[PDB]
Amino acid sequence: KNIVNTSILSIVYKKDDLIDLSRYGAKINIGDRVYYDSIDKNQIKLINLESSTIEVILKNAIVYNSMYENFSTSFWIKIPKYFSKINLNNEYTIINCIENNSGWKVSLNYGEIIWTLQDNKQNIQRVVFKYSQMVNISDYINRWIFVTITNNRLTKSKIYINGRLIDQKPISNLGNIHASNKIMFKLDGCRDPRRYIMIKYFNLFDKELNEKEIKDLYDSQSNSGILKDFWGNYLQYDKPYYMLNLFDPNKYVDVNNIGIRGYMYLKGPRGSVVTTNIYLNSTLYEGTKFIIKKYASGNEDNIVRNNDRVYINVVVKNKEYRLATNASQAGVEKILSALEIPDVGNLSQVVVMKSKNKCKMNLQDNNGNDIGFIGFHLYDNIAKLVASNWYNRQVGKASRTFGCSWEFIPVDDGWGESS
């Protein structure tokens, strides 16, 4: 019943190959320089080499002249930060269904995801998503984005980003769009040899998806049982993460002293990384690193899941300490401390990991009672990290709750700031 089942092409990883999950069984030819993420094999990396290619041949049986009258494409994409002036004014095709100068393609440029419909009279229409590299904290740079492009020959071509309309151009003026049976995924025309993309869950639909169908597609493909890091990859155990509190993203976490008389606090503003005319962003690699440690998970995999019960380690001067509190302290607000792992004793330290990318951490006492979601509280102009059941009540008493949602930011090559 999810609209994704109606896909006429659904590229997924199985065994050691990409296959069409649709019942229409397209053929998929993979070049020698196509890579899969060791953790999430559906994450495909295409690099800037002629052998980094995925060729889809649709069955001629499903390819008909008027199929591109109503159609949508959906996929997820991770586009590394553009670092060089070579990247400016260099539109490069990534997904090509063009034959006899008619069809559709997806291209990228500096801060752009571009859709092109060409008819058989060579009239073109472009819809364009623009994202700035001149922002403190980008929702788009080097992060998994869900793209949905819908097309109705009587109305418009529309581009959606994470389920939200961004551009729309009327296409009623265009002629007939040639239906190729070939789709080529490959970097085409990119003058920067170090460029790559990552792509997952490519779908083609023989329909103009509506807003409500795009939202179900986005929500269904999110995998909300697995937590995500800032980039949108799987959250992992034993991996160091810089912390961001979504209520105040211009701050980072620091530790004031080790032990139960010490505390953790939000501090800012963030620094800045710059290449004039290319990017200006807040530094992400700032503050105390958190490491998620297995408590209730076995050594099956290192993936952190919804409702996993974990420990949190905190790195101070390349040494690990345990996030803990005394649940007995006066007041709802329990100030967190970084404790010597030997000393934690019976101090509350078990955290329930939850999805709302948007991670929550529910601290529990040693009887499995809630101490509360990890957030912060102002004590005389210091925003100290706390566990507070204030947050747990507010979730049930308000449409929204602010301050107990976090992002976990590991070092990533597509971001390229010094670690």
Numbering used by the authors: 871 to 1226, 1233 to 1295
What is written in the article reporting this PDB entry?
Botulinum neurotoxins (BoNT) are a group of clostridial toxins that cause the potentially fatal neuroparalytic disease botulism. BoNTs are composed of three domains—a cell-binding domain, a translocation domain, and a catalytic domain. For BoNT/A, the HC/A binds to both a ganglioside (e.g., GD1a) and synaptic vesicle protein 2 (SV2C) at the nerve terminals of the neuromuscular junction. In this paper, we present the crystal structures of the botulinum neurotoxin A2 cell binding domain, both alone and in complex with its receptor ganglioside GD1a at 1.63 and 2.10 Å, respectively.
The structure of HC/A2:GD1a complex was solved by molecular replacement to 2.1 Å with two molecules (A and B) in the asymmetric unit. Clear positive difference map electron density was observed at the GBS of molecule B that could be readily modelled as GD1a, whereas for molecule A, the GBS is inaccessible to GD1a due to crystal packing. Therefore, the HC/A2:GD1a asymmetric unit contains both the GD1a-bound and unbound states of HC/A2. A total of 5/6 monosaccharides are clearly defined by the electron density. GD1a forms a total of 10 hydrogen bonding interactions to HC/A2, two of which are water-mediated. The superimposition of molecule ‘A’ and ‘B’ (for Cα atoms) yields an RMSD of 0.47 Å, indicating that the overall structure of the molecule does not change upon binding GD1a. However, the loop spanning residues 1269–1277 appears to widen upon GD1a binding—the distance between the Cα atoms of residues 1269 and 1277 is ~4.5 Å greater in molecule B than that in molecule A. This change in loop positioning is accompanied by the rotation of Phe 1278 towards the GBS, a feature that has been observed previously in the HC/A3:GD1a, HC/A4:GD1a, and HC/A5:GM1b structures. Using DynDom (which estimates domain motions in proteins), the HCN/A2 subdomain appears to rotate 3.6° in one direction when bound to GD1a, but 6.7° in the other direction when bound to SV2C. In both the HC/A2 and HC/A2:GD1a structures, clear electron density was observed between Lys 1236 and Cys 1280 indicating the presence of an unusual covalent bridge between the two residues.
